[PDB]
Design a protein around this ligand. Structure first.
Ligand SMILES: C[C@@H]1CC[C@@]2(OC1)O[C@H]1C[C@H]3[C@@H]4CC=C5C[C@@H](OCCC(CO[C@H]6O[C@H](CO)[C@@H](O[C@H]7O[C@H](CO)[C@@H](O)[C@H](O)[C@H]7O)[C@H](O)[C@H]6O)CO[C@H]6O[C@H](CO)[C@@H](O[C@H]7O[C@H](CO)[C@@H](O)[C@H](O)[C@H]7O)[C@H](O)[C@H]6O)CC[C@]5(C)[C@H]4CC[C@]3(C)[C@H]1[C@@H]2C
Ligand SMILES: C[C@@H]1CC[C@@]2(OC1)O[C@H]1C[C@H]3[C@@H]4CC=C5C[C@@H](OCCC(CO[C@H]6O[C@H](CO)[C@@H](O[C@H]7O[C@H](CO)[C@@H](O)[C@H](O)[C@H]7O)[C@H](O)[C@H]6O)CO[C@H]6O[C@H](CO)[C@@H](O[C@H]7O[C@H](CO)[C@@H](O)[C@H](O)[C@H]7O)[C@H](O)[C@H]6O)CC[C@]5(C)[C@H]4CC[C@]3(C)[C@H]1[C@@H]2C
Ligand SMILES: COC1=C(OC)C(=O)C(C/C=C(\C)CC/C=C(\C)CC/C=C(\C)CC/C=C(/C)CC/C=C(\C)CC/C=C(\C)CC/C=C(\C)CC/C=C(/C)CCC=C(C)C)=C(C)C1=O
Ligand SMILES: CCCCCCCCCCCCCCCCCC(=O)O[C@@H](COC(=O)CCCCCCCCCCCCCCC)COP(=O)(O)OC[C@H](O)CO
Ligand SMILES: CCCCCCCCCCCCCCCCCCCC(=O)O[C@H](COC(=O)CCCCCCCCCCCCCC)COP(=O)(O)OCCN
Ligand code: SF4
Lengths: 94, 58, 43, 324, 98, 64, 174, 71, 54, 100, 157
């Protein structure tokens, strides 16, 4: 059921209104750093890792050993990538 | 015992949290007649919709 | 003489070594212990 | 639905009061560690200080510098403040005491956390100031970096529970609080929460004396207040999340009739208060990292440990068939 | 007289219903398995309904007060068994499952 | 065709699919499996059902 | 009606993506489009995908775009051009796509015209599927890692390629 | 075990709820068939309540709403 | 150098042992009396030699 | 009418991506953004069909397509960055030397 | 107007209470006077307890404390910082140097009083003024703020 999302919308509307009231009452009285791109890429990768973790975590009781090892292989590939990034200095900000 | 001065704002924060819980709990209870049930699924919704008929049409 | 190279790696990278040990336990248990527990259940 | 706005206000208004008094409590505890008094003139024991500061802020003229991003500059604090507010819709304070009983609540919290970065980024870019822009970029990078570890710790709890429902996460700790077997995970979560809320020892925006200008330096009056309020509300929320995931939420310490006498909301509040006190205590105890050092900690320490804990917990639970 | 067979009453009596109306339940489920058309299953449905309503009236006759309390708590907590253990025990002590 | 339903049970149109596939697995002419195929596609899109109901609505609007 | 509101918001926000003079503004409108998409997903009952669109599209991809576009400091002279002379070519191409492609489902999926009669009473309820309902999350997780695990792993390979390429093309180690 | 208790409770009262729903739907379907017989009177070639599936196996009436069950 | 000393260094690094002492002695001052003077009801000490307003 | 309304929503997103390609001849960053818009529209098409058909295949593929979109954007923005680094500008007249 | 004046005076009292109870000075720490100012903010006198919090940015500041000698080289920097302060704002001149040039009055490089550059609300005498003298000066600032009638003056304008 999606019923529980309606209070969230009304909550958003009210929070927005509180924001406008608070902000509006006082009106009455060239140096590209590649390391930010690199940290964005790493965050993207591990964001997708968490994304894929969620269904796996709730499904462990049904997928049993096969699902566990398939996710382990997924993680092995991604962690080889992480080791590559670590060795190449992508994780060093000095 | 001077350190008790610092416990008053923390106590106020705790009371505030208790309010954010209990006020919304009692308003929902007053409006729906019973407290909110955690884990309302398809079965519970179908039960309530069918119970409206089984009550009102009796 | 790879027995103090591991010592040096543990001394210099305690976090990586701890992560490897924790994850390795998490991999060892299903790989080794679980089939043992399944075999003892069959008999 | 007609009574829903009353419930929403009964959440939002006491939360704003709680933030106002969290600022005062931080000042008081910091002072007492420093062998001084902190606010005690404005009201008895300084209890009227937050109202005076808020009144001063609303009575302050807004500046709104002559930038080309006039709309974005004022909307950034609104965005961060609204995001800080809306996470509380799914927080349960006791059994059945929650506005939205989301089945996907854990992922919803993760999404809100991921959205938090935009207010800081937009404030930095729209302010037309290279220092604010650089500081905002660094703060945003730090938050996204520690979000990875937060998500992985969330996954560890999820593996233990088998449901994204926050109330179910609480009730799964009736046998034992998750903070006991997963104590290092709880320590990791608290540190990651410090870093994610830009709090000491990770408070780059507070490092003006270190030649590091904060993202909100060009803000005055209520935009600056909105940023401040969102930050402190997020501190309260992180304390609440630590309580929910590892200290059993509203549950009593021991399943005994003596402890079951006192309501669950009080248990939850007391645990939240402990974590807020630890926030203040940590700010009082230690110096701060440099940006590069904290980034190294985020990627080189907390990510590998979080992933290892995911693997170890899942492997152990699968092996002995203890899954939910 | 006959209790209104609301969700609370049925859920509170579900254990008695399962122990008492098992053959009718199984027959209805088999027929539904073979044919989902509601018209082609009305007879087994009537058998199920008669069994359940008879058991409901019987249980109301035997332990009226305990049944009332258990049903009331079950409705109050939206059929959450855990929040109703005391009156469940009181209801089962006077109206045994057998 | 897969059989995996979006709520964790057999898909709505999977039995029609399987009847059509089993027919085509031994009928050397696909025209012999036309009826089962159009039953499968009707289950996916409800085209003829909705067309007939729209005819009913049309006649209601004409006689009013 | 609600789908009319969300589609109107998406239409305007997308036009702003493709027509805003400042690229930072384009990234921000793109974020509004993903929010509206998430709303549609909530209407479909797919709350996992609704949340994941926020986490990945807005939380990770749009952040990457914003970091890159903001540090570029693009001057409008480098990317400005008048679009009045494109109205005809967009008119044919849009119309042809409009006439063909907004109505492609009409012959296969004929809409049910809503009548002045309560059809809601003809909704048949099967309680058997409601005893143990599955979330979107657990229905997806029942399949990703066992019956279709090869595609999952190939996606992992795709992500590994992304990591390697990002390093090899941009890294300048201090 | 707690969840299995609830789930068993739902299983024992399933047949009576389904039987009630079946009776309700059959009565409503008879009323709708009479309605269609009246409306389509004087339309040649019609067949009241014709099954559009060749196999003739029973399907619930389609509703034209993509996901009605979640709201 | 030795497994015991390497282990003790690793634990101390992982468990933030030295961070605990700072927390503890910050907490000790929390309960002690404060040195703040309640101006203007209370004043700081001065001497007969104090050089103030001519 | 639900299914035609859900499909035309995704369809307007796809047409907007096409228009963004057509209208942005001097702005290749927006061209990349228009391509993402098309990919989002296709993803929405899979999810809507999954519900309409009561079938899970549309949902599995939607997740995998999200992975592809992420990798695509990462690599594309890397290529944008290096092109800008070589030229010091993103103007289209400095990426037209291969011809004929 | 027997009822409007009472409400107006109450509003003005509330505004003055808020503005006196939360004074956020920015410190212009130029010379030795800044050390006594640091002592005023320290544990013995604890300016925090009066609601006085020192801010890094003029944008979040209500008061500027000029603590030390102002040179001709520094004067433009002081004025620009003052011009970034949002209203209402006040200036406290601390010590003889800031007050009138002090020991450096006759120098070729020194501004003979910061009130040549910015309007001054309170002058705190001494070389340096004691920390308690600065606290007394801040209480005088509160006294001046408490004579404001902003709402009444605007109602009548
Ligand atoms: C600085 C300033 C200072 C001042 C200030 O502000 C700050 O300080 C602040 C501090 C605030 C107080 C803080 C706290 C409370 C407690 C609350 O009262 C308990 C809450 C009510 C409901 O919640 C309970 O119930 C939950 C469900 O069981 C518990 O969950 C269990 O079960 C879970 C699942 O297994 C486990 O997970 C959990 O672990 C497990 O505990 C939950 O924990 C527990 O809280 C108490 O309920 C009762 O009331 C019912 C009424 O209907 C009665 O029902 C009865 O009658 C029905 C009709 O016939 C029959 O149908 C029923 O069968 C039959 O029972 C009956 O008397 C009884 O139920 C009343 C409000 C008050 C005083 C606040 C006042 C305002 C302040 C003073 C603020 C103040 C403004
Ligand atoms: C964390 C950050 C923050 C930001 C954020 O996340 C990220 O925060 C997140 C928070 C999100 C919001 C959360 C929540 C919503 C609400 C949703 O809106 C619900 C709309 C749905 C539910 O509506 C009804 O649903 C039930 C009725 O269906 C009502 O039940 C009754 O009826 C039952 C049956 O009799 C009884 O049994 C019950 O007892 C009885 O009560 C129920 O009360 C009511 O709710 C869908 O409804 C429609 O759908 C119908 C079908 O299409 C349409 O039918 C029409 O077309 C048909 C032909 O097709 C014709 O036959 C029809 O005649 C003809 O009318 C019609 O338009 C309309 O009904 C719209 C999306 C939105 C805003 C989200 C936006 C995005 C966010 C801001 C996210 C945002 C991104
Ligand atoms: C030094 O660090 C500090 C700050 O950052 C500099 C602060 O902002 C602050 C203070 C910030 C605040 C008190 C914000 C408080 C805001 C609220 C409680 C919500 C609004 C409260 C009001 C009195 C505004 C009333 C607005 C209205 C339209 C009246 C109708 C209601 C303090 C105390 C502080 O110590
Ligand atoms: C960061 C952590 C890295 C971990 C890296 C180490 C592990 C990587 C994965 C290596 C593959 C499995 C190695 C583990 C050996 C034990 C496997 C085992 O125990 O057998 C089980 C079966 O395990 C498997 O078969 C799963 C294998 C995982 C798939 C790994 C991919 C290998 C190649 C795939 C080819 C596809 C092409 C690849 C595309 C890139 C028995 O299960 P069952 O048959 O009794 O019942 C099935 C289940 O319980 C119910 O669902
Ligand atoms: C009831 C009370 C509940 C309290 C809950 C909260 C507890 C308080 C948490 C806050 C404590 C103070 C926070 C301020 C300190 C922040 C600075 C942290 C710096 C840091 O992370 O250092 C890393 C080690 O710590 C870490 O790595 C931290 C993570 C430690 C996880 C432990 C991992 C292994 C544990 C063993 C498990 C084995 C059993 C299971 C099989 C290594 O980085 P560095 O650069 O500082 O190095 C130098 C080492 N001297
Ligand atoms: S007034 Fe005296 S103490 Fe203050 S800055 Fe000048 S010389 Fe130094």
């Amino acid at each position: 059921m999606m019923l529980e999302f309606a209070p969230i919308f009304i909550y958003l509307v009210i929070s927005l209104l509180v924001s406008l009231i608070l902000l509006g009452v006082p009106f009455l009285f060239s140096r590209f750093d590649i390391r930010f791109y690199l940290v964005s890429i790493l965050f993207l990768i591990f964001d997708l890792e968490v994304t894929f973790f969620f269904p796996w975590a709730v499904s462990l009781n049904k997928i049993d050993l096969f699902g566990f090892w398939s996710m382990m292989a997924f993680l092995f590939i991604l962690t080889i990538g992480f080791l590559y990034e670590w060795k190449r200095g992508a994780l060093d900000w000095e | 015992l001077v350190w008790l001065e610092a416990m008053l704002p923390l106590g106020i924060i705790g009371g505030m949290l208790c309010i954010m819980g209990n006020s919304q709990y009692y308003i929902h209870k007053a409006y729906h007649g019973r407290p909110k049930h955690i884990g309302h699924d398809e079965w519970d919704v179908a039960m309530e919709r069918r119970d409206k008929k089984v009550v009102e049409k009796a | 003489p790879v027995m103090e190279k591991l010592r040096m790696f543990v001394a210099q990278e305690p976090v990586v070594a701890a992560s490897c040990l924790i994850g390795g336990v998490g991999l060892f248990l299903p790989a080794v212990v679980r089939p043992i527990l399944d075999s003892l259940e069959a008999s | 639905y007609i009574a829903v706005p009353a419930e929403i206000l009964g959440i939002i208004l006491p939360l704003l009061l709680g933030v106002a008094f969290l600022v005062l409590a931080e000042r008081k505890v910091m002072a007492f560690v420093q062998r001084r008094k902190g606010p005690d003139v404005v009201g008895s024991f300084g209890l009227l200080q937050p109202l005076a500061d808020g009144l001063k802020l609303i009575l302050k003229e807004p500046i709104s510098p002559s930038s080309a991003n006039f709309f974005l500059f004022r909307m950034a604090p609104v965005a961060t403040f609204m995001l800080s507010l809306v996470a509380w819709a799914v927080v349960p304070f006791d059994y059945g005491m929650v506005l939205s009983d989301l089945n996907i609540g854990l992922l919803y919290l993760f999404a809100i956390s991921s959205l938090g970065v935009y207010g800081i980024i937009i404030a930095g870019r729209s302010s037309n100031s290279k220092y604010a822009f650089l500081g905002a970029l660094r703060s945003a990078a730090q938050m996204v970096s520690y979000e990875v570890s937060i998500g992985l710790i969330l996954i560890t709890v999820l593996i233990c529970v088998g449901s994204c429902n926050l109330s179910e996460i609480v009730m799964a700790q009736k046998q034992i609080w998750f903070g006991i077997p997963l104590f290092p995970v709880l320590v990791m979560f608290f540190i990651s929460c410090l870093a994610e809320t830009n709090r000491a020892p990770f408070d780059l925006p507070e490092a003006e004396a270190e030649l590091v200008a904060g993202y909100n330096v060009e803000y005055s009056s209520m935009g600056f207040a909105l940023f401040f309020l969102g930050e402190y509300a997020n501190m309260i929320l992180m304390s609440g999340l630590c309580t929910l995931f590892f200290l059993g939420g509203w549950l009593p310490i021991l399943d005994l009739p003596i402890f079951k006498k006192i309501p669950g909301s009080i248990w939850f509040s007391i645990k939240v208060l402990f974590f807020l006190f630890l926030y203040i205590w940590v700010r009082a105890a230690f110096p701060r990292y440099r940006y590069d050092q904290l980034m190294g900690l985020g990627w080189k320490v907390f990510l590998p440990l979080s992933l290892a804990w995911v693997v170890s917990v899942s492997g152990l639970l699968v092996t002995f068939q203890w899954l939910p | 007289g006959n209790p209104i067979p609301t969700s609370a009453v049925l859920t509170a009596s579900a254990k008695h219903i399962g122990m008492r109306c098992m053959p009718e339940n199984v027959a209805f489920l088999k027929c539904k398995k073979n044919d989902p058309n509601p018209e082609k299953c009305l007879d087994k449905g009537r058998d199920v309904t008669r069994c359940v309503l008879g058991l409901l009236k019987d249980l109301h006759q035997k332990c009226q007060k305990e049944m009332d309390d258990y049903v009331g708590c079950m409705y109050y907590y939206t059929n959450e068994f855990d929040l109703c253990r005391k009156e469940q025990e009181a209801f089962e002590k006077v109206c045994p499952l057998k | 065709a897969s059989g995996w339903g979006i709520t964790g049970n057999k898909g709505r149109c999977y039995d029609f699919w399987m009847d059509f596939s089993e027919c085509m697995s031994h009928c050397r002419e696909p025209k012999d499996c036309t009826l089962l195929r159009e039953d499968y596609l009707e289950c996916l899109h409800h085209s003829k059902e909705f067309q007939r109901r729209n005819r009913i609505y049309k006649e209601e609007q004409r006689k009013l | 009606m609600i789908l009319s509101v969300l589609s109107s918001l998406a239409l305007v926000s997308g036009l702003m993506v493709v027509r805003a003079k400042n690229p930072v503004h384009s990234v921000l409108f793109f974020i509004l489009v993903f929010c509206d998409t998430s709303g549609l997903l909530l209407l479909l009952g797919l709350d996992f995908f609704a949340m994941i669109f926020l986490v990945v599209y807005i939380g990770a991809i749009a952040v990457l775009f914003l970091f890159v576009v903001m540090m570029f400091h693009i001057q409008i002279a480098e990317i400005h051009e008048e679009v009045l002379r494109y109205l005809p070519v967009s008119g044919i191409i849009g119309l042809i796509f409009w006439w063909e492609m907004f109505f492609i489902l009409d012959n296969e999926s004929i809409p049910l015209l809503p009548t002045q009669r309560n059809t809601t009473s003809l909704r048949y309820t099967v309680y058997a599927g409601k005893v143990r309902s599955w979330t979107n999350l657990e229905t997806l997780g029942n399949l990703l890692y066992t019956y279709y695990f090869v595609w999952f792993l190939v996606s992992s390979l795709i992500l590994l390629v992304a990591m390697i390429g990002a390093i090899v093309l941009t890294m300048h180690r201090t | 075990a707690l969840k299995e208790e609830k789930y068993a409770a739902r299983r024992t009262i399933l047949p009576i709820l389904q039987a009630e729903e079946d009776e309700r739907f059959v009565s409503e379907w008879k009323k709708y068939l009479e309605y269609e017989a009246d409306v389509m009177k004087d339309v040649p070639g019609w067949k009241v309540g014709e099954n559009v599936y060749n196999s003739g196996r029973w399907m619930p009436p389609a509703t034209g709403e993509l996901r009605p069950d979640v709201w | 150098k030795d497994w015991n000393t390497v282990f003790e260094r690793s634990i101390n690094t992982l468990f933030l042992t030295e961070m605990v002492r700072g927390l503890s002695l910050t907490l000790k001052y929390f309960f002690d009396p404060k040195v703040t003077i309640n101006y203007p009801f209370e004043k700081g000490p001065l001497s007969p030699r104090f050089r103030g307003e001519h | 009418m639900d299914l035609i309304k859900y499909f035309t929503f995704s369809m307007i997103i796809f047409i907007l991506g096409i228009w963004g390609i057509l209208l942005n001849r001097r702005n290749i960053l927006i061209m990349l953004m228009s391509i993402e818009l098309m990919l989002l529209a296709v993803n929405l098409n899979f999810l809507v069909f999954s519900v309409s058909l009561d079938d899970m295949m549309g949902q599995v593929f939607a997740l995998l397509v999200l992975t592809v979109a992420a990798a695509e954007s990462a690599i594309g923005l890397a290529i944008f960055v290096i092109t800008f680094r070589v030229r010091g500008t993103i103007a289209v007249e400095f990426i037209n030397s291969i011809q004929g | 107007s027997k009822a409007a004046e009472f409400v107006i005076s109450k509003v003005d009292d509330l505004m003055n209470w808020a503005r006196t109870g939360s004074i956020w000075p920015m410190t212009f720490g130029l010379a030795c006077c800044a050390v006594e100012m640091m002592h005023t903010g320290a544990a013995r006198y604890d300016l925090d307890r009066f609601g006085i919090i020192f801010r890094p940015s003029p944008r979040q500041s209500d008061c500027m404390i000029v603590a030390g000698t102002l040179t001709n080289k520094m004067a433009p920097a002081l004025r620009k910082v003052y011009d970034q302060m949002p209203e209402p704002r006040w200036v406290i001149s601390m010590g003889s140097c800031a007050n009138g040039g002090g020991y450096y009055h006759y120098s070729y490089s020194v501004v003979r009083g910061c009130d040549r550059i910015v309007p001054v609300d309170i002058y705190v005498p001494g070389c340096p003024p004691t920390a308690e003298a600065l606290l007394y000066g801040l209480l005088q600032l509160q006294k001046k703020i408490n004579r404001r009638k902003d709402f009444l003056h605007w109602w009548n304008k």
